Amino acid sequence: DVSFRLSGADPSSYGMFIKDLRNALPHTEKVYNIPLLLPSVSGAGRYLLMHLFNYDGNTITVAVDVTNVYIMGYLALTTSYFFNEPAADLASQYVFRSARRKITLPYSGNYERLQIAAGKPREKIPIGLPALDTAISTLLHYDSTAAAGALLVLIQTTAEAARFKYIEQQIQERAYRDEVPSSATISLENSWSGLSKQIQLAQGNNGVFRTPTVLVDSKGNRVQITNVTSNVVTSNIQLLLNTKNI
Numbered sequence: 001d002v003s004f005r006l007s008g009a010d011p012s013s014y015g016m017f018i019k020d021l022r023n024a025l026p027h028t029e030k031v032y033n034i035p036l037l038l039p040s041v042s043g044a045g046r047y048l049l050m051h052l053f054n055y056d057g058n059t060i061t062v063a064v065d066v067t068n069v070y071i072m073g074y075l076a077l078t079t080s081y082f083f084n085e086p087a088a089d090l091a092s093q094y095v096f097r098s099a100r101r102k103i104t105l106p107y108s109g110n111y112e113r114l115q116i117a118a119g120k121p122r123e124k125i126p127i128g129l130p131a132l133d134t135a136i137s138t139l140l141h142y143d144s145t146a147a148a149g150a151l152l153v154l155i156q157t158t159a160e161a162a163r164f165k166y167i168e169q170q171i172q173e174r175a176y177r178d179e180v181p182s183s184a185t186i187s188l189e190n191s192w193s194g195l196s197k198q199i200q201l202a203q204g205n206n207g208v209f210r211t212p213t214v215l216v217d218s219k220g221n222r223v224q225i226t227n228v229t230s231n232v233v234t235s236n237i238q239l240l241l242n243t244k245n246i
Ligand SMILES: CC(=O)N[C@@H]1[C@@H](O)[C@H](O[C@@H]2O[C@H](CO)[C@@H](O)[C@H](O)[C@@H]2O)[C@@H](CO)O[C@H]1O
Pocket: 069, 070, 071, 072, 085, 087, 108, 109, 110, 111, 112, 155, 159, 160
């Protein structure tokens, strides 16, 4: 399992959590020095449990699929909650079985569905460590509209930061003040599967992407990624989604 406490948290302790979360995901191979997530993991071993604690010390446990870093559901007190999707229903056969009750959320876990439920796109929802404290608090008692926004914060400040060094740094900059994600952050989230695929196809193709990935950069300018020498590949992406799952 991995853990993070918002009480006393700083950029340093958040960076330790994100390192722990990365190191908890199994791999047997690296591709261009980046860990390649497993094609599949059978049984309960396919779920990592993240124990998150709000500033007041209350906690939820989040279940993460180790092959794709997708959050499946979470436990809050004696109630489990799962996204309305087959992967999550399958996860509910393995995790938080001891919960008194299981609620299926009224939406799947994809960004588009969550944004619909929350009533706003990611671009307008501030993220940061204070926003993560709020999200944990919100998830502690069921409210499916408030939970959608909370989950958009939770996904970005955990899974997306594990996947991209730049996003981890963006959250560290928001340790004590929330701010909506940069356009580059949104860009990277949206391109993770694409990037992971192109880096894996570059093996067999002399480090060259079969198809170029379009991204927005730090200064807000729109760049094209064509090969593994790009900073996105050498210094940013930390985990690769297996092409078997793409
Ligand atoms: C990173 C994380 O924990 N969660 C989200 C994913 O939920 C989401 O994936 C989508 O949701 C499900 C698979 O979980 C599926 O119904 C969709 O087709 C889609 O793949 C993803 C993109 O919205 O964002 C991740 O970060």
